[PDB]
Amino acid sequence: QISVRGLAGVENVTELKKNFNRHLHFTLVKDRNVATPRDYYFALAHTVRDHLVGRWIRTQQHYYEKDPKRIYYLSLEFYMGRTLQNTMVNLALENACDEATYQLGLDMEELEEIEEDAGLGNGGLGRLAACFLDSMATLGLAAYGYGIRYEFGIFNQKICGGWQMEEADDWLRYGNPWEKARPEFTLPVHFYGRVEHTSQGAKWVDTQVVLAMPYDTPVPGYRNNVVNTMRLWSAKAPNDFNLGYIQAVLDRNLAENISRVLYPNDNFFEGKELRLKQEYFVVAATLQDIIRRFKSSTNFDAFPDKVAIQLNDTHPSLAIPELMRVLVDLERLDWDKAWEVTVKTCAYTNHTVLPEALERWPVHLLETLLPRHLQIIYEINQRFLNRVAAAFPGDVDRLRRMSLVEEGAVKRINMAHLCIAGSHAVNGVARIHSEILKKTIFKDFYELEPHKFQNKTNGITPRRWLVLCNPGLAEIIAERIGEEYISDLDQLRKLLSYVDDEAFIRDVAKVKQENKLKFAAYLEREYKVHINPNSLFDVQVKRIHEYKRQLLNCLHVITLYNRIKKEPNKFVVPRTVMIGGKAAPGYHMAKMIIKLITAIGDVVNHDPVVGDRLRVIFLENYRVSLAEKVIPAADLSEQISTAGTEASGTGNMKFMLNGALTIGTMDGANVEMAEEAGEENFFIFGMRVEDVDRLDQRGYNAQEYYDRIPELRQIIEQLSSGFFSPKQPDLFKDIVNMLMHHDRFKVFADYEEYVKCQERVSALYKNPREWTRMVIRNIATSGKFSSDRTIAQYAREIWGVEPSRQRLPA
Amino acid sequence: QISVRGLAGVENVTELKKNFNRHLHFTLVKDRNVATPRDYYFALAHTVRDHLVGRWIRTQQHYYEKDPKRIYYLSLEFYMGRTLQNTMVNLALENACDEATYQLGLDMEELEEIEEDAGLGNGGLGRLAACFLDSMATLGLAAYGYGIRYEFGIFNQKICGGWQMEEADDWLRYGNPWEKARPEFTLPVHFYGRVEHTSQGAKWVDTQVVLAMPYDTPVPGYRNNVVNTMRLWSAKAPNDFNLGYIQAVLDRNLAENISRVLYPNDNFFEGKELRLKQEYFVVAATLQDIIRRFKSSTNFDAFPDKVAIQLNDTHPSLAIPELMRVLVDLERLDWDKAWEVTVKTCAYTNHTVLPEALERWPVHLLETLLPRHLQIIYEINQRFLNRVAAAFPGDVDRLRRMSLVEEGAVKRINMAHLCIAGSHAVNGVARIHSEILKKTIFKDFYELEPHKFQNKTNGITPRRWLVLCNPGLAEIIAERIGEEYISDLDQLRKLLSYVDDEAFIRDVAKVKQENKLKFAAYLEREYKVHINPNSLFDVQVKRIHEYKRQLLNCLHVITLYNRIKKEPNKFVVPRTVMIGGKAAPGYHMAKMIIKLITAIGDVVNHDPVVGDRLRVIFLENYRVSLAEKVIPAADLSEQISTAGTEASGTGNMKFMLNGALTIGTMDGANVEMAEEAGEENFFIFGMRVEDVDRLDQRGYNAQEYYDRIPELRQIIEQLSSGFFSPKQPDLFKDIVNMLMHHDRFKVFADYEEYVKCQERVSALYKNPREWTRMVIRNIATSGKFSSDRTIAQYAREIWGVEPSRQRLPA
Numbered sequence A, B: 001q002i003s004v005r006g007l008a009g010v011e012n013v014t015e016l017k018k019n020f021n022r023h024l025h026f027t028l029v030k031d032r033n034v035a036t037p038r039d040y041y042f043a044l045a046h047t048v049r050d051h052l053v054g055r056w057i058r059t060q061q062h063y064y065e066k067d068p069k070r071i072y073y074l075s076l077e078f079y080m081g082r083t084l085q086n087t088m089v090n091l092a093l094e095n096a097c098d099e100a101t102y103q104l105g106l107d108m109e110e111l112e113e114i115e116e117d118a119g120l121g122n123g124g125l126g127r128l129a130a131c132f133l134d135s136m137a138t139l140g141l142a143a144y145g146y147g148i149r150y151e152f153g154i155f156n157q158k159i160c161g162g163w164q165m166e167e168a169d170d171w172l173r174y175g176n177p178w179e180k181a182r183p184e185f186t187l188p189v190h191f192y193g194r195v196e197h198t199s200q201g202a203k204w205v206d207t208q209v210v211l212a213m214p215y216d217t218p219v220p221g222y223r224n225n226v227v228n229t230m231r232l233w234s235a236k237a238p239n240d241f242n243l244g245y246i247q248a249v250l251d252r253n254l255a256e257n258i259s260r261v262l263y264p265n266d267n268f269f270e271g272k273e274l275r276l277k278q279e280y281f282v283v284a285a286t287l288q289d290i291i292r293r294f295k296s297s298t299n300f301d302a303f304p305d306k307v308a309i310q311l312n313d314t315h316p317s318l319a320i321p322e323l324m325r326v327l328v329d330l331e332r333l334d335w336d337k338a339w340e341v342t343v344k345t346c347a348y349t350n351h352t353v354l355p356e357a358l359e360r361w362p363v364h365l366l367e368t369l370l371p372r373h374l375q376i377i378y379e380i381n382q383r384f385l386n387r388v389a390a391a392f393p394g395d396v397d398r399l400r401r402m403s404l405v406e407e408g409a410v411k412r413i414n415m416a417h418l419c420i421a422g423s424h425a426v427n428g429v430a431r432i433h434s435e436i437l438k439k440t441i442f443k444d445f446y447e448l449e450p451h452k453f454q455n456k457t458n459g460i461t462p463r464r465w466l467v468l469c470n471p472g473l474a475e476i477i478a479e480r481i482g483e484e485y486i487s488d489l490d491q492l493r494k495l496l497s498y499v500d501d502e503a504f505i506r507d508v509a510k511v512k513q514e515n516k517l518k519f520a521a522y523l524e525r526e527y528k529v530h531i532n533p534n535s536l537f538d539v540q541v542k543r544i545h546e547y548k549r550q551l552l553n554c555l556h557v558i559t560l561y562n563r564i565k566k567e568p569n570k571f572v573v574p575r576t577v578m579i580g581g582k583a584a585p586g587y588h589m590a591k592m593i594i595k596l597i598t599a600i601g602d603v604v605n606h607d608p609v610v611g612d613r614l615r616v617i618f619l620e621n622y623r624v625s626l627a628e629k630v631i632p633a634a635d636l637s638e639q640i641s642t643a644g645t646e647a648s649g650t651g652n653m654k655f656m657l658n659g660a661l662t663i664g665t666m667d668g669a670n671v672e673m674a675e676e677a678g679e680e681n682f683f684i685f686g687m688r689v690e691d692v693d694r695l696d697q698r699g700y701n702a703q704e705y706y707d708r709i710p711e712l713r714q715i716i717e718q719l720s721s722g723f724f725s726p727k728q729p730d731l732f733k734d735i736v737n738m739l740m741h742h743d744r745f746k747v748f749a750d751y752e753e754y755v756k757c758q759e760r761v762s763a764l765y766k767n768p769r770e771w772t773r774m775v776i777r778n779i780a781t782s783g784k785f786s787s788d789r790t791i792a793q794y795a796r797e798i799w800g801v802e803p804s805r806q807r808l809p810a
Ligand SMILES: O=C(NC1CC1)C(=O)N[C@@H]1O[C@H](CO)[C@@H](O)[C@H](O)[C@H]1O
Pocket: A122, A123, A124, A125, A126, A128, A265, A266, A267, A268, A313, A351, A352, A357, A429, A458, A646, A647, A648, A649, A650, A668
């Protein structure tokens, strides 16, 4: 059908069709008379999978031959989403499969909707890992993603009575055609036990063993025939485990629970033992694999030349003391040598500055679960503080501030401090975030070792986030500048010479309208809810959290509603406000915000006077697959976190690449986005980081805004009186109380400017031509936000490897 | 190589080789440089599996078209063993695969040893189900085996310090290439809840739901292109199950534990709740499947004409009240009509008369777990006893004896009584066993409904138990009478005309010697233990139980040892005594017997004076795959259970078919075997059932034998003094005490005759020619014991269907 989807050759379409029928018969054991759509999806998946194996085997053989430096990306989350379409895109098989299935009397788009998302992540952090794997494969790096194969990923969200209900994400129910179990590479992981100090070295004994079984998933690069590996570990009990008889066998579950479920927290630390086990489990199994592969290439001096370990936040921080343990206790290297190797091998990426999100494990937990690691951590702390003491003689407070060990009620280990001390590089994920790290939370560390601190602004893959989810836009763009931009996004700048092109302006606007129509139809199909495709699509999709301020969005929505009720026959640009995102199960305030959103919709959506001028919809079960649908359909992207709280944000980049304008604060990557497109082409509002600090120094008093802003006062009074909860008048008492007395994110402080800015948005939307021209200026300057750029920087500035766009023989 | 293994055609060997390489590449994702023997086994398994699918799909399509009466064999055990070789044999692919793998530089026998046994059974009962599935497919019956897919089958037995150690049988670790998950046919099963009596009918509400996910395994008939299905259910928790968040997800294990492990008891009832759940789980899911299939063919009058349900013992007895529940509560049929249909549909097979093995569930368990079923059972009991009262007016004791409800300490439900009342046919598994059922335990029922009682002597499949495990013997036999006997075992009688044939006598003896050499080599390979291939192989393999009397065998062994020590330079026929079998984990006496066996070996095997004249080896981890190795190598088969305790036995038949002579009591099928071959060609000894009864009436006093038999006295004194346990003098105090004071199986009573009989065995072994001629007379008359004969009788006399030897188009 369209160019960017590849060729539908005669031979290939014929070949695909026969292999499809082969798998349906031999693999699924079915016939066209009893096969269901799910059967067809699997037949198609196995057919596409076959095309991956050849490349997968030779890519790995290639790395064995050339023995390049290996990159190991350790993460407890990989938010992959669906794999079928992405694989077809990267292998240039989309049109061929489209034609082949068409000839078989099947609609491929229908089959793609059957695949379950691999939701092994919570949000931004997990999605970043997924985009990174795609980019590393596309740039020809010998990279491996290592994590845990959770039996249950992020929970599926159901909305009942306006409340969030959680249900298990049994994503493996029907099987996973993409993974390949590798039981032959099963490795043992140790827990508990005690440390024994003998003549030569310490020994960790009397441990409980849990086996780590790996499952490999192929990661195809974009049309370069490279196929890397994502290896996820699954917990298995040894067969002699606990070996009445029946009970012993049933208790195997205790050990296998390690890989059972993903902790559903976004930017929040929960110090649970099971989570610590998951963290050590992935680290212990991964490091043995890394060392095994390294020896199969004694000379650990070259270890840093052949290995790079990237820690995605502090979750896998135990890799530092585990590497020391192996080198010192097992390989018998002297401490100093082992430390040198460890530091040169490890690099750490920080993803947040919120205090409640930092990992600080109670010493008593480490003491019982990983006694040898605790000892190693104390030794690391001791030698590190000696270095600090020598650099800043007499500065006793600095010593207590920089210690890896925190004193107080319960002693804790600051994992972020552990990571900085044991890594040769520490980076933030957006320029403003990296600067904040050096000026505030890690200031002491920056003064001691300035060279370690870097910035690596996040990015998103243009394959999944443009070509895959928005073929219409990818097509009109290719028509003008070719297809080279898909793997070199900076080329989009060439579109700047079309900002005055009447044909292009028309096509861009047409693509957006078609996406909105397609999405508006979807909302009625799977969720039965009518919306006006001619209205401005105002959307805020991301995890629910106070710092992201979905509440500020809510205040604007109610303001719009009250203004209409006040002057009904006055014209206002029609809007469809869409808010979606999951709340962590134990995050009460977040769950109350979801309820507030649906409650607002319950009133606004049924008010005769409002008509189709304003609609408030809460997008249920926001996940990667839904993001691929709603982002291409958006007109306005809400990125309104309080300045200084959103480390980077990545959803913001997805919206910019897909033709939506942005209303946001100068926070995270929003700053660089506005800088790239020009502030005149961005809707910036609110306090800057400096303004927030001034307010804190003076003392934030929400009452002041309530007293001086009549419209704000009205909203709070409506909330308090039960206007949005007739049957339960005080239902939102907690929300009002927080807003009025202990709002850490200063919602009221940005209210006036936000509402004012929103008026400017509506004004521009009334002029289709100028709205679209500004959109082109955004799309054209979004090149910097490709994860290919991000990965190229990690490769050159941290890992010490050169990216390559060279194709491998297929 | 040999005839019976099929043709190794040019085209097929070429085709096999290419598909082997295809699977190794695409399916296993490997190359010849990194592939291990396990990888090769799987590539071969998938290649053979492909040949099954075509036939599997058309067989099932065939049944849908012709809509024949369906046979449902319900069992909680299916002791399948390995599947690769069996599939090749039944598809006539053995020589072709042998050649194809040979050309690829691989030894197929080596690859076959890699497959894990599907050990979803304990012993005879489970193996019978497996042989039956093979025969039903070979006789063209539209049959389905229904059971549970245990994650862990019978435990693997390790011997440590002469003691049995159990370890989990993680048979699914590397995957199961034979099964096909069918998540689309998942069905709900209910537990707990309460009964609500409304206007029209009762309702079972407030139940906890567990999902039953089926896994289908193909069952190929012998060269007739028929491929039936064995459907095993796996327990899955619903996604809204228990829906802190993490705990709720982790507790899903509670529900999924239902299909976690096989209860390891052989002829012993353990009233545990989890076992009851397993029993209802298989019954509930299976019946919905049966009814679904029946409706997809309202008129339940024809239900018995299209459905036959065979209950393998009482384990699935809940099928009776569950069928009533569905017909009455859900389909709204009147009780009388529903009962008529139920009785005509169900048939019950009893497998033992030992009191401790009968299922008698506490009413309080059924009351809580299956409240509606308890009510239905009481109603059944009420109507049944009214029938008894009308047939035997005034016989109040008969009423209490025949009740399904047993009174006493705790009220219990006798499941055997439930089965007889609700089945149109009840059968024993050997003539003597079926007679005992009518004369003793079920005498009252027989007098009420004589027509229900039948006999169906057990059998074994000649495919697995001759062709597969003993190709050498199958070959020399085919050379004389052709291959027709493999599916018509009665033809072996033609071998009687070769009993005087010098060439045949030589070949038979040669095959046995080769098997013994092959086994003697295996013992050194995997277990490092030297044995003399020229000695008589005396073997007793079967589960360890007091009624099977491995202890009587032990007494003879020690007698042989003491006789040698007494007259060292006297000649005695060399023997290798082999005993193997697992003991239930909680069966203390059984575990002590295993220890005694190894203790005897510890003394006998290292006594210089004995030399290679006597060896006692305990065969570790006896299972189907080991049976296929040791049975063809045996000279003497020990079937010495106390008369009246072994319902049938099937191991006895395997030995007879493979060239071993039998020493045994007139118990179970031994009686019919001796009758078929002629008592002169069998080594019968001991009390008959009548003799045992006389002894009980008089009172069994072991002391009497101890006082009158000097050799027996010596053995008991050696045991009591610690002769076989120097470091632990009283180690066997429990054994001696039981033998002397409370031996329910009268070991001493048969000692003299047993030892005398054993002398006659040794005398015949000294004359190779006459020993072999008697062997031929046994092999030649073993035809009656083919499970094809057994199944043909079930088909005609119970299920009402005609067996067919007609091939289906491949
Ligand atoms: O869960 C997260 N962080 C702490 C729990 C470790 C997490 O997802 N942080 C997220 O990481 C993304 C990619 O770097 C950024 O775009 C987001 O701003 C940040 O919140």
